[PDB]
Write a protein that holds these residues in place. Structure first.
Motif, PDB file in Angstrom:
ATOM      1  N   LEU A  30       0.838  -1.422   0.337  1.00  0.00           N
ATOM      2  CA  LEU A  30      -0.715  -0.468  -0.287  1.00  0.00           C
ATOM      3  C   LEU A  30       1.254   1.539   0.071  1.00  0.00           C
ATOM      4  O   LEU A  30       0.503   2.801  -0.952  1.00  0.00           O
ATOM      5  N   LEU A  33       2.167   1.819  -3.615  1.00  0.00           N
ATOM      6  CA  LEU A  33       0.662   2.119  -4.054  1.00  0.00           C
ATOM      7  C   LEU A  33       0.640   4.157  -3.849  1.00  0.00           C
ATOM      8  O   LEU A  33       0.466   4.515  -4.834  1.00  0.00           O
ATOM      9  N   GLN A  34       0.857   3.764  -2.679  1.00  0.00           N
ATOM     10  CA  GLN A  34       0.584   4.947  -2.581  1.00  0.00           C
ATOM     11  C   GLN A  34       1.886   6.377  -2.860  1.00  0.00           C
ATOM     12  O   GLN A  34       1.006   7.435  -3.504  1.00  0.00           O
ATOM     13  N   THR A  37       0.120   7.395  -6.005  1.00  0.00           N
ATOM     14  CA  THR A  37      -0.297   8.093  -6.261  1.00  0.00           C
ATOM     15  C   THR A  37       0.059   9.515  -6.138  1.00  0.00           C
ATOM     16  O   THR A  37      -0.876  10.475  -6.730  1.00  0.00           O
TER      17      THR A  37
ATOM     18  N   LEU B  29      -8.313  -2.235   0.827  1.00  0.00           N
ATOM     19  CA  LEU B  29      -7.637  -0.722   0.891  1.00  0.00           C
ATOM     20  C   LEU B  29      -6.574  -0.136  -0.987  1.00  0.00           C
ATOM     21  O   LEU B  29      -6.895   0.330  -0.971  1.00  0.00           O
ATOM     22  N   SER B  30      -6.077  -1.391  -1.088  1.00  0.00           N
ATOM     23  CA  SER B  30      -5.365  -1.719  -2.161  1.00  0.00           C
ATOM     24  C   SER B  30      -6.237  -0.686  -3.264  1.00  0.00           C
ATOM     25  O   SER B  30      -5.893  -0.534  -4.318  1.00  0.00           O
ATOM     26  N   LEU B  32      -8.937   1.065  -3.471  1.00  0.00           N
ATOM     27  CA  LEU B  32      -9.773   1.647  -3.389  1.00  0.00           C
ATOM     28  C   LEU B  32      -8.268   2.368  -3.712  1.00  0.00           C
ATOM     29  O   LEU B  32      -8.277   4.056  -4.452  1.00  0.00           O
ATOM     30  N   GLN B  33      -7.242   2.616  -3.527  1.00  0.00           N
ATOM     31  CA  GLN B  33      -5.556   3.023  -3.962  1.00  0.00           C
ATOM     32  C   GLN B  33      -5.544   2.541  -5.577  1.00  0.00           C
ATOM     33  O   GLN B  33      -5.110   3.486  -6.141  1.00  0.00           O
ATOM     34  N   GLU B  35      -8.009   3.333  -7.860  1.00  0.00           N
ATOM     35  CA  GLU B  35      -8.876   3.293  -7.853  1.00  0.00           C
ATOM     36  C   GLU B  35      -8.783   4.955  -7.714  1.00  0.00           C
ATOM     37  O   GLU B  35      -8.898   6.480  -8.741  1.00  0.00           O
TER      38      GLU B  35
ATOM     39  N   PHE C  24      -7.444   0.174   9.415  1.00  0.00           N
ATOM     40  CA  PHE C  24      -7.685  -0.193   8.077  1.00  0.00           C
ATOM     41  C   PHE C  24      -9.391   1.019   8.338  1.00  0.00           C
ATOM     42  O   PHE C  24      -9.518   1.317   7.059  1.00  0.00           O
ATOM     43  N   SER C  28      -9.070   4.049   4.940  1.00  0.00           N
ATOM     44  CA  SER C  28     -10.101   3.686   3.832  1.00  0.00           C
ATOM     45  C   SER C  28     -11.353   5.179   4.152  1.00  0.00           C
ATOM     46  O   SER C  28     -11.436   5.711   3.087  1.00  0.00           O
ATOM     47  N   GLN C  31      -8.965   7.593   2.013  1.00  0.00           N
ATOM     48  CA  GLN C  31      -8.926   7.283   1.095  1.00  0.00           C
ATOM     49  C   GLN C  31     -10.546   7.978   0.029  1.00  0.00           C
ATOM     50  O   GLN C  31     -10.161   8.463  -0.878  1.00  0.00           O
ATOM     51  N   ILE C  35      -9.581   9.922  -2.842  1.00  0.00           N
ATOM     52  CA  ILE C  35     -10.427  10.204  -4.293  1.00  0.00           C
ATOM     53  C   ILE C  35     -11.495  10.485  -4.910  1.00  0.00           C
ATOM     54  O   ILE C  35     -11.358  11.337  -5.569  1.00  0.00           O
TER      55      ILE C  35
END
Lengths: 81, 76, 68, 80
Positions: A30, A33-34, A37, B29-30, B32-33, B35, C24, C28, C31, C35
């Motif tokens: 993560l 990927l962050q 991002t 989480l991944s 949504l990452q 996305e 978690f 989220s 995030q 997004i």
């Protein structure tokens, strides 16, 4: 059953170890990927280009002011005909 | 005695629930990452902005042409 | 001592699951806010409408040129 | 008896390492996520884009003024 306790201990250790492996596999997955991002975000920052674009549109406007001055000068002359 | 076996069975269950929640959380989480990065890619309009400026420049060049034309009519 | 220790381990493991769910759940939430914020930075419609206006501007320039 | 205590004691130690790794990861990812949202905020250029469009519209409006002025010279040149 002293050995039993030992096998149950080794099984507990192995699992806990795999859990720690899954946790480490994720967190860096993560985080990486962050990092991609935030980078893609930086790309979407077109602040400078827009500001430059406006200043050129402004030069344009100041050039139409000029064109008008010249226009009305021709107007005067043809009026003093 | 074998109370340890039942105890071990319980410990296995709880630890299994833990691993499941870890995998579920990371999997969600991944997704949504991916996305997030994809939506960000949409926010990139570098090409569009640049074509816009090139159009303003052509327009400016056209202004210079008219200016020359005007002075030309002046000399007449 | 095996059960009392088992009760202790259960508490810690239970606390572990709680921290997992908390982390978690929090990440989220940031995030979905991320997004959504990213979606705001999309200006495709505005940028294009702006260009179409410049095209009219050029079209008027060509009109002026022919008038002269 | 004793061998059970050390076994339990290890579980405390290892699980503590687990909690630490969990806390480190979550704390790190979130901090980099807040860096993400802040960077995303940078990419919003709606206000600049809007002022930009309004200036081009003024530019067009001024062009229309020129068109009206230009015709004036045609009416007067048409005198002859």
């Amino acid at each position: 059953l002293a050995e039993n306790s030992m096998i149950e201990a080794e099984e507990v250790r192995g699992t806990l170890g795999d859990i720690s492996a899954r946790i480490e596999a994720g967190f860096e997955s993560l985080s990486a990927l962050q990092v991609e991002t935030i980078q893609t975000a930086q790309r979407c920052d077109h602040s400078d280009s827009i500001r430059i674009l406006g200043e050129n549109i402004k030069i344009l406007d100041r050039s139409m002011k000029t064109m008008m001055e010249t226009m009305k000068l021709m107007m005067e002359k043809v009026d003093l005909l």
